[PDB]
Amino acid sequence: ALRGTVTDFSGFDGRADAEVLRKAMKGLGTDEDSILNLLTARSNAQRQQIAEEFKTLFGRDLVNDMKSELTGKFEKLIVALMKPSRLYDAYELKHALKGAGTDEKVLTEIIASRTPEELRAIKQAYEEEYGSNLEDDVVGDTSGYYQEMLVVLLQANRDPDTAIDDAQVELDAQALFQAGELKWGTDEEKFITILGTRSVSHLRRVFDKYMTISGFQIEETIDRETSGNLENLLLAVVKSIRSIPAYLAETLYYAMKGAGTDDHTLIRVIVSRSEIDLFNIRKEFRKNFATSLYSMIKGDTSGDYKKALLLLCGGEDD
Ligand SMILES: [Ca+2]
Ligand SMILES: [Ca+2]
Ligand SMILES: [Ca+2]
Ligand SMILES: [Ca+2]
Ligand SMILES: [Ca+2]
Numbered sequence: 196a197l198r199g200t201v202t203d204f205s206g207f208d209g210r211a212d213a214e215v216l217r218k219a220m221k222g223l224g225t226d227e228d229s230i231l232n233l234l235t236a237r238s239n240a241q242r243q244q245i246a247e248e249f250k251t252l253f254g255r256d257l258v259n260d261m262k263s264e265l266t267g268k269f270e271k272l273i274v275a276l277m278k279p280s281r282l283y284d285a286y287e288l289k290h291a292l293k294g295a296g297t298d299e300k301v302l303t304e305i306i307a308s309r310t311p312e313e314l315r316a317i318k319q320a321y322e323e324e325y326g327s328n329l330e331d332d333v334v335g336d337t338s339g340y341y342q343e344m345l346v347v348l349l350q351a352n353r354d355p356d357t358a359i360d361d362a363q364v365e366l367d368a369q370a371l372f373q374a375g376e377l378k379w380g381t382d383e384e385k386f387i388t389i390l391g392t393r394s395v396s397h398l399r400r401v402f403d404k405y406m407t408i409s410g411f412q413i414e415e416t417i418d419r420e421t422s423g424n425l426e427n428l429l430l431a432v433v434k435s436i437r438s439i440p441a442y443l444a445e446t447l448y449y450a451m452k453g454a455g456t457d458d459h460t461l462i463r464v465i466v467s468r469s470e471i472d473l474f475n476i477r478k479e480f481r482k483n484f485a486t487s488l489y490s491m492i493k494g495d496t497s498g499d500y501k502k503a504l505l506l507l508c509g510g511e512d513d
Contacts, residue, residue: 197471197472197475198472198473198474198475199468199469199470199471199472199473199474200469200473200474200477200507200508200509200510201235201238201239201469201470201473201507202238202470203238203240203241204236204237204238204241207237207241207244209241209244209245209247209248210248210252212233212237212241212245212248213245213248213249213252213253213257214252215229215233216229216230216233216245216249216257217249217252217253220260220261220264225264225265227265227269227499228499228502230261230265230273231269231273231499231502231503231506232506234273234276234277234503235276235503235506235507236506238470239276239279239280239469239470240280242276242277243279245257246258246277257277258274258277261273261274261277262274267500268458268462268496268500269498269499269500269503271458271459271462272462272466272500272503272504273503275462275463275466276466276503278466280470281316281320282320282324283466283467284305284309284313284317284320284467285317285320285321285324285325285329286324287301287305287463287467288301288302288305288306288317288321288329289321289324289325289332292332292333292336297336297337299337299341299424299427300427300460301463302333302337302345303345303424303427303428303431304431304446304460304463305317306345306348306349307348307428307431307432307435307442308431308435308439308442308443311351311352311353312351314348314349314351315351317329318330318349318351329349330346330349333345333346333349334346337424339423339424339425340383340384340387340425341423341424341425341428343387344387344390344391344425344428344429344432345428347387347388347391347392348391348432352392353391353392353393353394353395354392354393354394354397355394356394356395356396356397357394357396359396359397359400360397363397364397364400364401364404365404367389367393367397367401368401368404368405368407368408369408370385370389371385371386371389371401371405371413371416372405372408372409373385374386375416375419375420376409376411376416376419376420381420381421383421383425386417386421386429389401390429390432390433390436391432395436398436399436399437401413402433402436402437413433414430414433414434417429417430417433418430438479439472440472440475440476440478440479441479441483443464443468443472443476443479444476444477444479444480444483444484444488445483446460446464447460447461447464447465447476447480447488447491448480448483448484448491450464451491451492451495456495456496461492461504464476465504465507465508466507469507473507473508474510476488477489477508477510477513478513480513481513487510487511487512487513488508488510488513489505489508489509489510489511489512489513492504492505492508493505
């Protein structure tokens with residue numbers, strides 16, 4: 196099943212951990228090594244208890260103190276690691292929508308790869324934290340079919356996996372064929388309804404059947420029929436339906452692909468999935484890119500930031 200790389204540390208003592216952290220920042224200097232080896236070895240819920248003990252003992256906010264002592268990517272990784280799990284995805288979405296400029300790669304990445312259950316959780320958290328409706332904020336900063344597809348997904352009303360109705364699979368496959376390849380132009384609405392509301396098990400069957408009747412994989416047709424933000428979203432949805440860990444592994448790969456590194460994306464995926472399916476993401480990363488995620492990271496990052504990442508990911512050998 197699904198498996199992360201971070202678990203609750205046994206023999207957990209919040210007060211003790213708070214003191215270790217406190218001693219690592221007191222006086223001039225900062226013992227980063229001590230901080231990273233500790234926080235990456237504690238589950239997210241435990242980090243929250245440490246933060247609570249820290250404030251109780253010293254009357255200081257652990258996160259703000261680290262924001263003062265830490266710098267750069269390492270600081271960003273530590274701050275994201277301290278964000279409550281139930282609020283992280285909402286946090287990211289909020290930052291991708293705030294100020295002039297909307298970060299579409301973020302909206303697409305999260306809303307496409309998160310399950311209906313997760314999306315429901317994210318919407319509640321977002322509203323309680325920012326006193327604003329997530330859907331309304333998305334609509335306000337986006338437009339066209341891209342916006343429409345995101346809204347469909349945000350409803351979290353995807354059909355439930357039940358017995359497969361063969362005739363419905365043929366109907367849907369043929370409907371997609373007719374809405375794209377056999378149509379002068381494209382019927383985006385058809386693509387949105389089907390890909391956004393049908394059950395996961397149903398769609399996996401539709402993808403195979405579509406391949407059989409058209410000679411094309413649904414991804415190829417999408418690339419041939421659509422463009423812009425809509426194309427990226429549709430591909431994210433399809434890839435997620437097939438395998439969320441694969442889609443995420445691919446997102447990671449392209450983050451460390453070529454000159455430089457998309458650090459924000461790199462941190463987001465590793466942190467948000469660390470306690471869910473990061474282990475699976477590794478297996479999908481190896482099987483599809485001839486290398487282990489560990490090596491990719493180990494050879495694209497530097498310093499403490501690099502050390503923290505490797506400890507969270509693990510898998511040195513894969
Ligand atoms: Ca200090
Ligand atoms: Ca904006
Ligand atoms: Ca067409
Ligand atoms: Ca295209
Ligand atoms: Ca790189």
